[PDB]
Amino acid sequence: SRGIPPKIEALPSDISIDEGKVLTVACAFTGEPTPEVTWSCGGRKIHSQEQGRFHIENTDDLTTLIIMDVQKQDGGLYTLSLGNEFGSDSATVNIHIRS
Amino acid sequence: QGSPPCFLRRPRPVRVVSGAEAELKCVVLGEPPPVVVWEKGGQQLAASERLSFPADGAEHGLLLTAALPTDAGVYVCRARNAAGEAYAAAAVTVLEPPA
Numbered sequence: 001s002r003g004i005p006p007k008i009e010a011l012p013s014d015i016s017i018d019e020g021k022v023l024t025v026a027c028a029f030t031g032e033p034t035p036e037v038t039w040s041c042g043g044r045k046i047h048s049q050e051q052g053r054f055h056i057e058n059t060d061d062l063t064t065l066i067i068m069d070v071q072k073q074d075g076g077l078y079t080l081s082l083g084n085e086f087g088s089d090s091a092t093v094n095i096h097i098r099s
Numbered sequence: 100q101g102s103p104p105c106f107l108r109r110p111r112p113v114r115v116v117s118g119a120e121a122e123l124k125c126v127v128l129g130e131p132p133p134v135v136v137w138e139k140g141g142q143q144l145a146a147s148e149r150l151s152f153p154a155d156g157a158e159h160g161l162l163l164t165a166a167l168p169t170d171a172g173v174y175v176c177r178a179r180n181a182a183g184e185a186y187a188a189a190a191v192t193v194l195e196p197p198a
Contacts, residue, residue, distance in 0.1 A: 009112060009188075009189070009190065010112065010173045010174075010175075010188035010189050010190045011188055012138075012173075012175045012186050012188050013141075014141070015177075015184075015186050016184075017183070017184050021103065021181075021182060021183040021184065022103035022182055022183030022184075023183060023184055023185075023186075024103065024104065024105060024106070024183065024184070024185035024186070025185075025186050025187075026106055026109050026185070026186070026187040027187070027188070028109065028111075062109075064106075
């Protein structure tokens with residue numbers, strides 16, 4: 001049984017969403033043991049909450065980030081980071097909000 | 100009554116030999132049924148003799164009839180309706196014969 005460092009698969013470099021609408025971004029990964037997923041923006045962890053507009057759903061090889069009723073303040077560079085006992089990986093997507 | 104796009108199945112990476120077919124697939128839900136487009140290198144892809152977009156209800160694909168080395172790279176699947184957008188990406192690798 002071999003450990004596998006985390007590896008993020010393809011992630012869009014830039015995405016757009018109109019203000020007020022819902023945005024979903026899904027990204028696959030590999031890693032053994034299953035990596036811990038962290039989404040961040042402005043160097044700060046995004047916390048998934050039942051109430052609130054930000055939701056994160058993580059499985060063994062997928063993360064989905066949902067931002068509901070998107071606001072101008074949500075725009076910016078988002079980082080997806082993965083960690084496990086054998087390494088780390090990160091990628092970014094730049095989210096553009098249209099008025 | 101709107102509800103934003105979501106993926107049931109996301110495009111997966113594919114590794115093919117130069118000249119062979121390459122296919123990406125997604126299955127998307129939402130109300131109304133989302134419109135799916137595909138992007139590469141910052142630009143929306145258009146249908147031609149070498150690139151088609153087979154679809155069957157919620158299932159939407161991308162089919163390269165004969166993949167060339169210049170077809171390699173990251174493809175982004177963008178699903179859209181009045182309520183929102185969903186994005187998922189996948190990398191196509193194309194292997195050239197030696198020597």
